[PDB]
């Protein structure tokens, strides 16, 4: 390291943290995304939403 | 004279009991309820039914709500009286619940055998056995039909009945795995029973049919249901025969607000054997006679309440490397936690620790959130298994920190967690709020 | 015939000065090594007993 | 290097601190930012009589 390179060493060479949530007081607040079939079949059954009076009658 | 001699004797200590009264016990006000009818019909099962086979059924959307689902089996017993032990739930090796092809829960035959060890109590557990075993000293060749009720989030309270009205797109289905070996039916110990018949099964689904004022409501309003899940994977233990009490740290890998943890130790070759075998009444085949052997249970009596034959000496649970509570001996988790939390009797070899005041209910009452906890561990200490199982003088006459030499076979550890999640139904699309 | 290995997962938090460990014989307090028929290494070491 | 004494066999130490015997902090391993810490051990083969 040169006098100048050394300040940049810290900023560039030394690895940065990829997981910084401490697993607490914060934690994995983002990793809980909903499980839902990511767009089901909307054919057989859609009429109970838009044509409901017909189903009830 | 008479009751009025008590009634008129009103005083200072009654001002907080009957002064300015709020309720009267002798006129009930009843609530009027929405019209519905209960109907259960058979579903069609896909796949070949048999030992070791996997089958599934997709639930026809004939009803509005799904409540109880019962899996019906017919079996012929392949052995003599006392050779079976809840064979109906052994056969139902597991069941997986999906809503629209997305996992909600999954239960295993050992759980079913652990659930009635913990939560199903009095008459219903005896009746449960009546629905799952041969309980009248029946002989080989006897055939009967069995009723194995499922215990998913939606069947034990109508309040969580599964909403088909509002689940226009996610079709609900069940996957079943059938056991390759059922004791006293297909196998006797490790030996196949020649001529044993294949089981036949059907699934009954209890549909609720609603009227038009409320059925309209269901289809139009969003819903969020607070539901339960079971978390599970197994592990093995080290159980010493002599000179030491072994320790074992079993790392917990659970998520979500957990109402309780429960576990058992068993011999994986004998379904429901959670204690050591011994040459005492009901504790092994032939017990009390010259023909007694302590390697095979007298199966119909596999369950016992004699904790002396249980392997566990003590257990402690740590939260983020710190003690969650001080170490307890094994009989605490077998007798006291279920006394304080459930109100039944837990058989020896099955243990529960609650975080909840009343885990048997569905109203949340205290939970441990294992998704915000760095690590948690179940630290076990075992009894020294130095007692000759064949000598009643030693089996029935020793100290707490020792148990029978046959306890060394109880190598299978099953740790269950029972938690909460939220089922969201939005404009016909269903799924779960948290995936952890 | 083998040299077994373990990967022990640690449960620590907070600023740590050091990690220390020992391999104990749970039946004999403070015993952290093997026992042998040499002076001070086992009971009766060096004699027929 | 860290203490300046003799440690009986079977007891092992690895320090993060330059002077762990004292109280003045002299370097630490803050496990609050280490999500998976593992101690890997290899054993010697127990073949000597």
XYZ file of C-alpha atoms in Angstrom:
591
model
C 0.000 0.000 0.000
C 1.009 3.533 -0.903
C 0.151 6.451 1.344
C -2.821 7.180 -0.885
C -3.794 3.586 -1.722
C -4.120 2.744 1.980
C -7.130 5.059 2.556
C -8.739 3.539 -0.489
C -7.816 -0.027 0.766
C -10.222 0.319 3.590
C -12.975 1.707 1.358
C -12.457 -0.763 -1.512
C -10.528 -3.991 -0.715
C -11.985 -5.014 2.661
C -15.188 -7.025 2.228
C -18.581 -5.496 2.994
C -21.345 -7.169 4.991
C -24.024 -8.992 3.021
C -26.155 -9.915 6.095
C -26.475 -6.973 8.484
C -29.818 -7.518 10.316
C -28.171 -9.016 13.484
C -31.060 -11.602 13.355
C -32.737 -9.397 16.056
C -33.632 -5.747 16.770
C -34.359 -5.634 13.044
C -33.739 -9.204 11.808
C -35.119 -10.729 8.578
C -38.148 -8.398 8.448
C -38.285 -8.755 4.672
C -37.990 -12.529 4.280
C -41.604 -13.700 4.887
C -43.215 -13.094 1.469
C -46.685 -14.624 1.062
C -47.315 -18.049 -0.428
C -50.207 -17.921 -2.831
C -49.895 -19.863 -6.067
C -48.670 -16.789 -8.078
C -51.906 -16.433 -10.176
C -54.207 -19.468 -9.975
C -56.596 -20.711 -12.657
C -59.363 -18.080 -13.001
C -61.670 -19.985 -15.362
C -63.907 -22.340 -13.450
C -65.192 -20.389 -10.484
C -64.797 -16.671 -11.481
C -68.624 -16.304 -11.772
C -69.008 -16.433 -7.966
C -67.369 -12.997 -7.857
C -68.973 -11.116 -10.735
C -72.165 -13.129 -11.428
C -72.964 -14.062 -7.819
C -76.765 -13.304 -7.780
C -77.166 -15.911 -10.513
C -75.391 -18.530 -8.375
C -77.558 -17.777 -5.353
C -80.781 -17.813 -7.365
C -86.873 -20.658 57.473
C -85.748 -22.105 54.169
C -83.860 -20.305 51.421
C -85.301 -16.961 52.350
C -83.419 -17.159 55.680
C -80.222 -16.848 53.545
C -81.676 -14.517 50.911
C -82.685 -11.629 53.185
C -79.370 -11.717 55.096
C -77.911 -9.058 52.808
C -74.839 -7.202 53.952
C -71.650 -5.211 53.489
C -69.794 -8.072 51.845
C -72.592 -8.497 49.252
C -72.266 -4.976 47.770
C -69.687 -6.278 45.283
C -71.629 -9.500 44.570
C -75.311 -8.656 44.292
C -75.521 -4.886 44.851
C -76.198 -2.992 41.565
C -76.658 -6.317 39.755
C -75.434 -6.777 36.209
C -76.532 -10.304 35.107
C -79.287 -12.719 36.174
C -78.600 -16.470 35.809
C -82.258 -17.471 35.455
C -83.145 -15.941 32.069
C -80.821 -16.800 29.183
C -80.783 -14.543 26.124
C -80.113 -16.585 23.005
C -78.509 -15.403 19.778
C -80.136 -16.017 16.398
C -77.835 -17.667 13.853
C -77.429 -17.752 10.062
C -78.994 -20.706 8.237
C -76.716 -23.612 7.365
C -76.947 -27.368 6.946
C -74.276 -29.973 7.651
C -73.594 -32.640 5.030
C -70.691 -35.061 4.597
C -70.120 -36.926 1.318
C -67.402 -39.217 -0.104
C -64.596 -37.858 -2.223
C -62.893 -39.654 -5.096
C -59.311 -40.695 -4.382
C -56.686 -40.571 -7.099
C -54.068 -43.306 -7.201
C -53.781 -46.933 -6.162
C -54.679 -47.658 -2.532
C -52.371 -50.003 -0.649
C -49.481 -50.432 1.762
C -46.646 -48.076 0.934
C -48.627 -46.291 -1.778
C -49.258 -42.571 -2.091
C -52.747 -41.304 -2.968
C -54.440 -37.934 -3.133
C -57.883 -36.428 -3.428
C -59.083 -33.076 -4.637
C -62.062 -31.834 -2.679
C -65.093 -31.193 -4.872
C -66.390 -27.694 -4.261
C -69.941 -28.797 -3.558
C -70.142 -26.900 -0.294
C -69.557 -23.440 1.005
C -67.268 -24.345 3.880
C -65.201 -27.381 4.742
C -65.178 -28.466 8.322
C -64.293 -31.994 9.481
C -62.649 -34.480 7.142
C -62.534 -38.138 8.177
C -60.423 -40.744 6.395
C -62.204 -44.104 6.391
C -60.281 -47.378 6.254
C -61.375 -51.017 6.200
C -58.761 -53.498 7.451
C -58.633 -57.225 8.306
C -56.442 -57.987 11.315
C -53.499 -60.234 10.459
C -52.646 -61.240 14.029
C -54.300 -62.334 17.241
C -55.693 -60.116 20.021
C -53.327 -57.525 21.445
C -51.022 -57.519 18.409
C -52.214 -54.110 17.138
C -51.874 -50.570 18.521
C -53.880 -47.844 16.754
C -53.215 -49.455 13.352
C -55.515 -47.001 11.544
C -53.287 -44.027 12.258
C -50.185 -46.058 11.606
C -51.509 -46.655 8.050
C -52.133 -42.962 7.505
C -48.393 -42.329 7.444
C -48.961 -38.635 6.667
C -51.387 -36.061 5.196
C -50.455 -32.844 3.417
C -52.897 -29.967 3.116
C -52.704 -27.740 0.060
C -54.933 -24.863 -1.027
C -54.494 -24.390 -4.742
C -51.337 -26.525 -4.811
C -49.586 -24.518 -2.048
C -48.619 -26.093 1.272
C -50.543 -25.071 4.399
C -49.669 -27.922 6.846
C -48.603 -31.563 7.016
C -49.213 -34.167 9.734
C -47.475 -37.469 10.354
C -48.699 -40.712 11.937
C -46.417 -40.148 14.920
C -47.989 -36.737 15.420
C -51.511 -38.221 15.450
C -50.215 -40.692 18.072
C -48.676 -37.731 19.938
C -51.752 -35.505 19.673
C -54.060 -37.849 21.558
C -51.192 -38.241 24.037
C -51.513 -34.527 24.785
C -54.756 -32.856 23.681
C -57.439 -35.467 23.032
C -58.671 -36.499 26.482
C -61.316 -38.564 28.396
C -64.037 -40.327 26.336
C -62.929 -38.950 22.960
C -59.491 -40.564 23.263
C -61.030 -43.912 24.174
C -63.507 -43.403 21.341
C -60.587 -42.309 19.182
C -59.061 -45.722 19.791
C -62.448 -47.331 19.125
C -62.246 -45.590 15.754
C -58.618 -46.623 15.178
C -57.928 -49.978 16.859
C -59.389 -53.325 17.867
C -60.418 -52.825 21.511
C -62.603 -55.819 22.395
C -60.029 -58.676 22.267
C -60.932 -59.405 18.655
C -59.333 -62.409 16.963
C -57.336 -62.824 13.731
C -59.470 -62.399 10.637
C -61.761 -59.808 12.190
C -62.543 -56.926 9.868
C -63.902 -53.499 10.746
C -63.951 -49.991 9.377
C -61.930 -47.264 11.054
C -62.533 -43.512 11.141
C -59.423 -41.378 11.276
C -60.419 -37.717 11.799
C -57.867 -35.169 10.566
C -56.899 -32.229 12.804
C -56.068 -29.362 10.446
C -56.761 -25.708 11.385
C -60.300 -25.731 9.995
C -62.023 -28.736 11.613
C -61.983 -28.394 15.394
C -63.936 -25.138 15.574
C -66.558 -24.124 12.988
C -65.138 -20.598 13.289
C -62.179 -21.515 11.054
C -64.127 -23.606 8.523
C -62.265 -23.406 5.186
C -63.966 -20.793 2.926
C -64.798 -22.368 -0.437
C -67.207 -19.526 -1.384
C -64.303 -17.089 -1.312
C -61.771 -19.507 -2.860
C -62.947 -19.480 -6.446
C -59.525 -20.271 -7.861
C -57.392 -22.202 -5.322
C -58.764 -25.711 -5.265
C -58.134 -27.514 -1.988
C -56.527 -30.938 -2.011
C -55.100 -33.568 0.310
C -52.131 -35.872 -0.270
C -51.906 -39.073 1.793
C -48.942 -41.398 2.224
C -49.769 -44.888 3.339
C -47.507 -46.938 5.555
C -45.641 -49.907 4.160
C -45.872 -51.656 7.554
C -48.761 -51.675 10.060
C -48.214 -53.788 13.180
C -50.548 -56.774 13.504
C -52.044 -56.200 10.058
C -49.301 -56.392 7.448
C -46.303 -57.058 9.714
C -45.719 -58.645 13.131
C -42.490 -57.049 14.293
C -40.227 -57.170 11.244
C -41.888 -60.263 9.761
C -44.474 -59.929 7.010
C -47.870 -61.507 7.653
C -48.622 -63.867 4.771
C -52.024 -63.369 3.193
C -52.557 -59.918 4.717
C -55.170 -57.927 2.806
C -54.632 -54.514 1.252
C -56.618 -51.687 2.906
C -59.390 -49.904 1.145
C -60.103 -46.268 1.848
C -62.413 -43.342 1.244
C -62.418 -39.754 2.504
C -65.507 -38.086 3.908
C -65.593 -34.299 3.743
C -68.049 -32.393 5.888
C -69.502 -29.597 3.762
C -71.499 -26.752 5.210
C -74.283 -25.387 3.010
C -75.186 -21.734 3.789
C -78.188 -19.593 2.776
C -78.189 -16.580 0.380
C -77.733 -13.560 2.736
C -74.486 -14.901 4.153
C -73.316 -16.790 1.065
C -73.390 -13.445 -0.781
C -71.331 -11.869 2.001
C -68.621 -14.533 1.828
C -68.049 -14.141 -1.905
C -67.663 -10.341 -1.723
C -65.754 -9.546 1.519
C -62.027 -10.190 1.981
C -61.075 -12.712 4.614
C -58.196 -13.321 6.976
C -58.295 -16.442 9.163
C -55.929 -17.013 12.089
C -54.811 -20.611 11.606
C -52.379 -23.154 13.024
C -49.395 -25.027 11.490
C -47.322 -28.051 12.486
C -43.521 -27.898 12.029
C -41.466 -31.076 11.989
C -38.297 -33.017 11.037
C -36.840 -35.953 13.018
C -33.448 -36.757 14.604
C -31.671 -39.571 16.476
C -30.381 -39.798 20.063
C -27.476 -41.349 21.971
C -28.792 -43.398 24.904
C -26.092 -45.000 27.125
C -26.330 -48.313 28.946
C -23.835 -47.565 31.687
C -21.545 -45.338 33.795
C -22.905 -42.075 32.378
C -25.926 -39.882 31.787
C -25.467 -38.668 28.233
C -26.225 -35.137 27.124
C -27.538 -34.121 23.738
C -28.030 -30.627 22.295
C -30.670 -30.779 19.562
C -30.834 -27.511 17.604
C -34.322 -26.201 16.924
C -35.202 -24.952 13.451
C -38.671 -23.473 13.904
C -40.393 -20.246 12.814
C -43.629 -18.323 13.686
C -45.482 -17.576 17.011
C -45.376 -20.968 18.628
C -47.841 -21.922 21.319
C -45.966 -25.071 22.303
C -43.188 -27.540 21.578
C -43.735 -31.243 22.242
C -41.607 -34.321 21.806
C -41.234 -38.047 22.255
C -38.618 -40.772 22.069
C -39.480 -44.029 20.366
C -38.263 -47.283 18.914
C -38.788 -46.558 15.189
C -39.691 -50.205 14.493
C -42.683 -50.258 16.868
C -45.255 -47.572 16.252
C -46.211 -45.698 19.414
C -43.568 -47.283 21.675
C -42.418 -44.297 23.714
C -41.055 -46.212 26.716
C -38.686 -49.085 27.326
C -39.965 -52.673 27.330
C -39.884 -54.610 30.591
C -40.978 -57.932 32.090
C -43.831 -56.298 34.020
C -47.627 -56.262 33.296
C -48.408 -54.778 29.911
C -44.796 -53.691 29.380
C -43.696 -56.406 26.902
C -44.931 -59.509 25.126
C -45.490 -62.390 27.534
C -44.775 -60.188 30.566
C -45.116 -62.006 33.875
C -44.626 -65.499 32.408
C -41.649 -67.655 31.462
C -42.238 -66.748 27.793
C -41.731 -63.032 28.457
C -39.454 -61.179 26.058
C -38.437 -57.521 26.316
C -37.592 -56.947 22.645
C -41.227 -57.020 21.447
C -44.136 -55.152 23.065
C -47.480 -56.626 23.996
C -48.640 -54.139 21.335
C -52.211 -53.481 22.499
C -50.697 -52.249 25.781
C -47.802 -50.309 24.207
C -48.890 -47.094 25.917
C -48.075 -46.785 29.585
C -48.045 -44.228 32.373
C -44.978 -45.676 34.139
C -42.350 -42.966 33.638
C -39.729 -45.336 35.122
C -39.449 -46.879 31.640
C -38.982 -43.495 29.919
C -35.502 -42.540 28.753
C -35.461 -38.797 29.480
C -33.930 -37.656 32.769
C -34.043 -33.883 32.238
C -34.513 -31.233 29.567
C -33.883 -27.500 29.217
C -34.654 -25.109 26.358
C -32.320 -22.210 25.619
C -33.285 -19.007 23.810
C -30.408 -17.286 21.948
C -27.931 -19.289 23.999
C -29.483 -18.194 27.329
C -31.672 -20.390 29.512
C -35.360 -19.966 28.846
C -36.120 -21.644 32.177
C -34.170 -23.724 34.677
C -33.594 -27.446 34.062
C -36.500 -29.759 34.857
C -36.581 -33.505 35.170
C -38.452 -35.434 32.482
C -41.525 -36.177 34.603
C -42.187 -32.383 34.801
C -42.896 -32.168 31.057
C -44.878 -35.449 31.162
C -47.048 -34.619 34.187
C -46.999 -30.945 35.157
C -46.974 -28.871 31.930
C -50.039 -30.804 30.630
C -51.694 -30.479 34.047
C -51.187 -26.703 34.078
C -51.864 -26.135 30.344
C -54.247 -28.871 29.055
C -55.901 -30.743 31.925
C -55.377 -34.370 30.869
C -52.891 -37.167 31.428
C -49.900 -37.600 29.131
C -48.497 -41.138 28.760
C -44.906 -41.816 29.649
C -42.345 -40.960 27.009
C -44.281 -37.986 25.597
C -43.365 -34.517 26.804
C -44.777 -31.049 26.318
C -43.594 -27.560 27.206
C -46.015 -24.727 26.552
C -45.567 -21.016 25.937
C -49.360 -20.722 26.017
C -51.767 -20.540 28.928
C -54.300 -22.796 27.166
C -52.670 -24.331 24.071
C -55.647 -26.670 23.613
C -57.770 -23.716 22.575
C -57.516 -21.629 19.437
C -57.735 -18.214 21.085
C -54.043 -17.182 21.203
C -52.793 -17.270 24.776
C -49.039 -16.704 24.744
C -46.560 -17.642 22.033
C -42.817 -17.863 21.417
C -41.861 -16.246 18.097
C -39.104 -18.428 16.676
C -38.719 -16.191 13.583
C -37.190 -13.402 15.737
C -34.946 -15.699 17.801
C -31.311 -16.221 16.707
C -31.043 -19.829 17.955
C -32.928 -22.091 20.365
C -31.826 -25.485 21.650
C -33.409 -28.463 23.391
C -30.764 -29.817 25.764
C -31.453 -33.326 26.998
C -29.904 -35.459 29.733
C -30.760 -39.150 29.630
C -31.210 -41.729 32.353
C -28.530 -44.376 32.642
C -30.085 -47.495 31.102
C -28.477 -49.971 33.470
C -31.592 -51.827 34.798
C -32.089 -55.390 33.490
C -35.525 -55.066 31.850
C -36.362 -58.703 32.599
C -36.141 -58.426 36.412
C -39.246 -56.812 37.984
C -37.315 -56.422 41.254
C -35.009 -53.982 39.451
C -37.533 -52.490 37.009
C -40.015 -51.592 39.762
C -37.442 -50.979 42.500
C -34.933 -48.300 41.514
C -33.821 -44.662 41.500
C -35.052 -41.843 39.248
C -31.848 -41.278 37.245
C -31.706 -44.872 35.886
C -33.999 -46.842 33.579
C -34.132 -50.148 31.713
C -31.429 -51.372 29.300
C -34.120 -51.700 26.615
C -34.508 -47.872 26.707
C -31.374 -47.757 24.530
C -33.636 -48.704 21.606
C -35.625 -45.448 21.937
C -33.317 -43.781 19.436
C -35.870 -41.792 17.439
C -36.448 -38.252 18.653
C -39.479 -36.345 17.387
C -39.677 -32.603 18.206
C -42.899 -30.873 17.099
C -43.784 -27.185 17.123
C -47.359 -25.955 16.895
C -47.610 -22.376 15.599
C -49.848 -19.586 14.230
C -50.081 -18.164 10.682
C -52.691 -16.175 8.766
C -54.736 -17.463 5.811
C -55.603 -14.633 3.422
C -58.414 -14.923 0.885
C -58.469 -11.911 -1.431
C -60.999 -11.768 -4.315
C -60.938 -15.517 -4.779
C -57.190 -15.955 -4.419
C -55.935 -17.742 -1.320
C -52.572 -18.083 0.353
C -50.588 -17.560 3.590
C -49.401 -14.171 4.982
C -46.052 -15.391 6.315
C -43.606 -17.835 4.613
C -40.998 -18.793 7.234
C -8.642 -46.419 11.460
C -10.186 -42.935 11.185
C -9.680 -39.356 12.365
C -13.209 -38.145 13.033
C -14.105 -34.468 12.850
C -16.939 -32.289 14.106
C -18.361 -28.935 13.066
C -19.794 -27.606 16.324
C -22.211 -24.743 15.790
C -21.595 -22.039 18.370
C -24.284 -19.984 20.111
C -22.527 -16.806 21.164
C -23.320 -13.088 21.027
C -21.691 -9.888 22.510
C -17.916 -8.772 22.308
C -15.830 -11.809 23.089
C -12.370 -11.791 24.573
C -11.667 -15.476 23.892
C -12.980 -18.994 23.293
C -11.697 -21.827 25.458
C -12.643 -25.451 25.578
C -11.887 -28.791 27.119
C -12.669 -32.425 26.505
C -14.066 -33.887 29.686
C -14.698 -37.340 31.037
C -18.112 -36.612 32.637
C -17.557 -39.353 35.240
C -14.277 -37.939 36.635
C -14.311 -34.218 37.417
C -11.466 -32.230 35.864
C -10.156 -35.106 33.794
C -9.316 -33.708 30.357
C -6.906 -36.339 28.959
C -6.527 -40.037 28.279
C -5.436 -42.364 31.089
C -2.334 -44.565 30.783
C -0.079 -47.004 32.650
C 2.574 -44.310 33.217
C 3.376 -42.227 36.354
C 0.490 -40.025 37.416
C -1.587 -41.065 34.393
C -3.802 -43.730 36.040
C -4.453 -45.376 39.391
C -1.668 -47.782 40.314
C 0.412 -46.731 37.297
C 3.709 -48.599 37.037
C 2.613 -51.577 39.157
C 0.758 -54.808 38.446
C -2.399 -53.216 39.894
C 1.416 -15.362 23.993
C -1.745 -14.169 25.728
C -1.320 -15.175 29.400
C 2.230 -16.301 30.090
C 1.608 -19.534 31.989
C 1.356 -23.255 31.449
C -1.957 -24.793 30.518
C -2.536 -28.443 31.453
C -3.097 -30.821 28.588
C -6.686 -31.175 27.411
C -7.568 -27.505 27.954
C -7.284 -25.276 24.896
C -7.533 -21.552 24.312
C -7.804 -19.261 21.270
C -7.854 -15.541 22.085
C -9.203 -12.549 20.192
C -7.767 -10.278 22.866
C -4.160 -9.249 23.257
C -4.368 -9.398 27.087
C -7.384 -11.558 28.006
C -6.084 -11.971 31.573
C -6.863 -8.320 32.293
C -10.003 -6.196 32.240
C -8.957 -3.407 29.882
C -10.487 -4.424 26.535
C -7.670 -5.469 24.239
C -9.598 -6.635 21.191
C -12.873 -8.468 20.754
C -14.857 -10.772 18.540
C -18.314 -9.230 18.473
C -20.591 -12.184 17.781
C -23.540 -9.812 17.399
C -22.400 -9.440 13.780
C -21.365 -13.066 13.177
C -24.375 -15.053 12.086
C -22.752 -18.496 11.835
C -19.763 -19.337 14.028
C -18.453 -22.887 13.905
C -15.699 -24.652 15.803
C -14.248 -27.430 13.662
C -12.302 -30.111 15.472
C -10.379 -33.100 14.207
C -9.537 -35.847 16.655
C -6.474 -38.018 16.907
C -7.019 -41.754 16.417
C -7.259 -43.603 19.748
C -5.184 -46.620 18.722
C -2.445 -46.708 21.435
C -2.847 -49.405 24.085
